[PDB]
Amino acid sequence: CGGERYLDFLRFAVFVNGESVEENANVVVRLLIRKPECFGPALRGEGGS
């Protein structure tokens, strides 16, 4: 529940007027992969469904 609320904020930061803001999109993706736990128990890599 808490994670979804932060996800939609990043949705508005990277997508403006129907186009993707590449400056923000690249930063968010790199930040997300540096902390893989942001993807939930799934998409965890090892031991993750």
Partner: protein, 221 residues
């Protein structure tokens, strides 16, 4: 005097693992011909079983900043943290790369680490990052430092995986500390050095030390 890693130097990528409370040191190795994938050669038992170091040596060909790498991709330096390095396999003359395939079943987000025939593309470039707060970006990389290698193309760490029963190296999102132990920096003309392949001649270039030919009765021993 503090040793600094420079280009054209031969190094070995060495990591550490825990096996039955024992610290086991492993070197990244690859055959090149017939098998592109990289494996781990143990070296802690070199007293009793010599490791196969002929396929563990890599040459630091280039070391560039991220912007310089981007510019050169569109078209003896000292190693600095945050730079991108190009590792060439000493034996097969191939380049260490983050392969797009994945033979592991435990990690779905991991990629195989292997050798690439050419240095083209960004899949064969790795960025060095400090493992601890002791070193910062832009500082010189010193011998014995723990490094964090990140693939430029895949944004994944050079990871040692212990999920299976064996020890395997792959490109995952979990970091792993590596040591770039130097092998040789600069060799004078002539002046035999360790790790070379040579012949031992007896007299005036007439007889040389050798074993029996193939399919011989003495089992070539």
């Amino acid at each position: 005097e503090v040793q600094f890693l420079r280009t054209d130097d031969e190094v070995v990528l060495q990591c550490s693992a825990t096996v039955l409370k024992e610290q086991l040191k492993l070197c990244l190795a690859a055959e090149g011909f017939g098998n592109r994938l990289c494996f781990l050669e143990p070296t802690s038992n070199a007293q009793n079983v010599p490791p196969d170091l002929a396929i563990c040596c890599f040459t630091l060909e280039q070391s560039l900043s991220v912007r310089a790498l981007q510019e050169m991709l569109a078209n003896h330096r000292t190693l600095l943290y945050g730079h991108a390095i190009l590792l060439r396999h000493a034996h097969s003359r191939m380049y260490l790369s983050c392969l797009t395939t994945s033979r592991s079943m435990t990690d779905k987000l991991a990629f195989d680490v292997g050798l690439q025939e050419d240095a083209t593309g960004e899949a064969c470039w790795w960025t060095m990052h400090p493992a601890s707060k002791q070193r910062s970006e832009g500082e010189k990389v010193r011998v014995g430092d723990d490094l964090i290698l990140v693939s430029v193309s895949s944004e994944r760490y050079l990871h040692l995986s212990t999920a299976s029963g064996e020890l395997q190296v792959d490109a995952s999102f979990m970091q792993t500390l590596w040591n770039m132990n130097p092998i040789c920096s600069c060799c004078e003309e002539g002046y035999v050095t360790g790790g070379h392949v040579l012949r031992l001649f007896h007299g005036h270039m007439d007889e040389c030390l050798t074993i029996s030919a193939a399919d011989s009765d003495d089992q070539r021993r």
